[PDB]
């Protein structure tokens, strides 16, 4: 498992560290779209932060199943349910939370499970990408004296049925 940079903000070079974390706050609302990224590692770019994605950069074609482990970094007292939905290649992201339900999805709570893990069934590279979508099932519930904003870290990796198949070389200089 390696950290999946879903959040992208380069200009703030001083604090490039923001790229490792989700913002989830009370100023949101039900069904609001928290985040969304593609389920293809070889392509740029949220997967490029992964050890997997850049090894794939050294290879040409590949196929296998992936899994993304989400870890909640909020307080013990913070609660709220979030919907993670997978939408397979072909067919766009669901219009709204309800339409994300009909496809394979996961109802994630912060109350009981601090870390949920999503399995990506299969993605090959026979040459769209697939699509991971995370939704706000509920409000972000927090008591007095507790932060109105928390952060999520996404950890991703491939499973043992993953194979890379043809060798290629990348882009980083010498001297």
């Amino acid at each position: 498992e390696t950290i999946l940079e879903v959040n992208n903000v380069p200009t703030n070079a001083t604090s490039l560290m923001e790229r490792l974390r989700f913002p989830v706050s009370a100023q949101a609302g039900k069904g609001e779209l928290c985040a969304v990224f593609r389920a293809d590692p070889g392509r740029s770019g949220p997967w490029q932060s992964t050890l997997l994605g850049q090894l794939c950069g050294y290879y040409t074609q590949w196929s296998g199943s992936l899994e993304v482990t989400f870890m909640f970094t909020g307080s013990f007292m913070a609660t709220g349910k979030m919907l993670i939905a997978y939408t397979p290649p072909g067919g766009p992201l669901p219009k709204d939370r309800a339409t994300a339900m009909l496809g394979t999805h996961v109802i994630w709570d912060f109350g009981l499970q601090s870390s949920v893990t999503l399995v990506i069934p299969w993605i090959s590279n026979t040459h769209t990408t697939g699509l991971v979508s995370i939704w706000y099932q509920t409000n972000y519930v927090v008591p007095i004296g507790a932060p109105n904003t928390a952060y999520i870290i996404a950890l991703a990796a491939a499973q043992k049925n993953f194979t890379m198949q043809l060798c290629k070389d990348a882009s980083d200089i010498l001297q």
Partner: protein, 231 residues
């Protein structure tokens, strides 16, 4: 279960009337054609959405099977078909802080015939609109609560299947409902077999914290669905 989010199963489960939902035996089922039993695909956990509970709210109610008639495969396997039979597994989830407080009455009322105002004196031989009587997925908000908007006291509702949700003890209600009707098979769009009822009895309150609105998530999934006529 496509995403069983363990809430650590407990004795909150409440069998309807000591009657677990079951497929109608064809000796019971007055029909000779093979009844469509639609696998797991429609038995998936349908989560309506989340309603925001606030201290001024009075309650909400849904109408089975009107809730799902236009929501996914089940809806499609009902609108198309002519006769319908099923049970349900109601999982009302209310996640709130340990500093919040309130009390909900998750309840199921068969044949929830709604009565609406006829006039401050009773001026009208009126009848409630398609929206109010069949709110569907979004659900409808009660207007008069002490009376269950049907000349009926909520003080005795607990005579129906019910599960309390006290915020100091539990966050989850779990009611399973068997098919209850005079006929073994009825229409899906016209006869709302029963109604889901969830009414805050002990009202929500808080010293001004950081959250003023407690979410109520309703997940539900059919138990023993059954369909007959095709298109």
């Amino acid at each position: 279960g496509n995403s069983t989010i363990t809430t650590q199963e407990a004795a909150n489960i409440i069998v309807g009337y000591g009657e677990w939902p079951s497929y109608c035996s064809d000796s019971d089922a007055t029909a000779v054609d093979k009844p469509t039993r639609p696998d797991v695909s429609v038995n998936r956990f349908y989560t309506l959405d989340t309603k925001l509970w606030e201290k001024s709210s009075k309650g909400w109610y849904w109408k089975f099977p009107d809730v799902l008639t236009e929501t996914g495969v089940f809806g499609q396997n009902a609108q198309f078909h002519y006769l319908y039979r099923s049970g349900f597994c109601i999982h009302v989830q209310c996640n709130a802080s340990k500093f919040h407080q309130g009390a909900l009455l998750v309840a199921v009322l068969p044949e929830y015939v709604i009565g609406t105002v006829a006039g401050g004196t009773g001026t009208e031989d009126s009848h409630p609109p398609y929206k109010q009587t069949q709110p569907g997925a979004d659900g409808f908000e009660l207007q008069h609560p002490y009376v269950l908007d049907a000349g009926i006291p909520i003080s005795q509702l607990t005579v129906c299947p019910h599960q309390w949700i006290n915020l100091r003890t539990n966050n989850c209600a779990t009611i399973i409902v068997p098919y209850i009707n005079a006929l073994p098979f009825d229409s899906a769009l016209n006869h709302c077999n029963f109604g889901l009822l969830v009414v805050p009895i002990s009202p929500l309150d808080y010293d001004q914290g950081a959250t003023p609105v407690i979410p109520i998530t309703i997940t539900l999934a059919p138990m023993c669905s059954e369909f007959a006529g095709l298109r």
